[PDB]
């Protein structure tokens with residue numbers, strides 16, 4: 360697609376409430392996973408990881424990695440992605456959580472574990488996708 364995967368979207372000044380990140384693309388026909396990683400260097404404040412075939416099930420895993428410890432996984436069985444199909448992911452930053460919507464439907468909320476939001480300066484987009492667009496705006 361017009362953007363190369365993996366793709367790093369800089370977040371100058373980090374994330375702040377009211378920030379909306381929009382990502383559009385298509386899932387590859389033989390997809391295994393998608394990853395969105397809100398990063399503070401080597402740490403990952405918010406890892407959003409649709410897994411298409413984990414023990415023969417679809418699941419979204421969300422987590423945080425701080426000092427190479429992954430935390431408690433937050434798992435959602437609701438899974439709005441499909442092999443070969445277009446998607447739109449929107450992540451809205453609020454003061455207490457990230458809110459994620461896919462295809463204009465609310466999917467999940469993830470409470471901030473890494474709380475220095477102005478230091479989360481990169482969003483990495485990786486995995487089995489074609490990416491058409493990735494951008495952010497303050498709403």
Ligand SMILES: CO[C@@H]1[C@@H](n2cc(-c3cc(F)c(F)c(F)c3)nn2)[C@@H](O)[C@@H](CO)O[C@H]1S[C@@H]1COC[C@H](n2cc(-c3cncnc3)nn2)[C@H]1O
Nearest residue numbers: 392394406408414420421422423429430431432434485486
């Ligand atoms: C492979 O390690 C993944 C982590 N990961 C994935 C990637 C990644 C990055 C990229 F750039 C990529 F391109 C890319 F493809 C993947 N980087 N780190 C990350 O997703 C992390 C999130 O917690 O998970 C580990 S695997 C983690 C291992 O520990 C046990 C966990 N396990 C199994 C079950 C469980 C619970 N309920 C029902 N069935 C099974 N529960 N926990 C398991 O999920």
